[PDB]
Amino acid sequence: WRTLVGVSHTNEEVRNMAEEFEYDDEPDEQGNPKKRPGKLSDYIPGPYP
Amino acid sequence: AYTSHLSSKTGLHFGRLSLRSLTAYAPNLMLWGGASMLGLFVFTEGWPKFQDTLYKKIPLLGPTLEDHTPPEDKPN
């Protein structure tokens, strides 16, 4: 996501684009899986698992 | 009227290096020291720490190195 900033989009625009997807996070204090919205350091996700 | 001796003395030295040879070479060594600093400035021009301390203050050349990218085009 960070490679689109300053090339075809604005920083504030790419952040909104990434936040519409979900990524695996660190497990909580009990060890269960968690999810979080995307960041600029993430990669563009694909349609199939 | 007449001369029967030769008055002389020994000059200060240590090995192959004498005091008279050092005074002859002193002005030239300062130019080499000056020319060595200039060569260092050529090879450290891309170093940002040296840019913010020395090169950015040079008139007509300093402002050239400045980056003016607005924050909205920087990911980091």
A39 interfaces chain B, CB cutoff of 8 Å: no
Q: What is the interface size between A and B, counted as CB pairs within 8 Å?
A: 21
On whether the CB atoms of residues A37 and A22 are closer than 8 A, the answer is yes
The answer to whether the CB of A11 falls within 8 A of the CB of B71 is: yes
Cα distance between residue A1 and residue B65, in whole Å: 29
Query: Rounded to whole angstroms, what are the CA distances from B48 to A48, B19, B65, B68?
Result: 45, 44, 10, 15
Nearest CA in chain A to B71: A11
Which approach determined this entry? cryo-EM
Which residues on B lie below 8 Å from A12 (Cβ)? 72
SS3 of residue A29 by DSSP: coil
Contacts of B61 (CB under 8 A, 6+ apart): B55
CA distance A12 to A14: 6
Q: Length of chain B, please?
A: 76
Distance from CA of B67 to the nearest CA of A (A): 14
Resolution (A): 2.4
CA angle B49, B52, B53 (to 5 degrees): 85
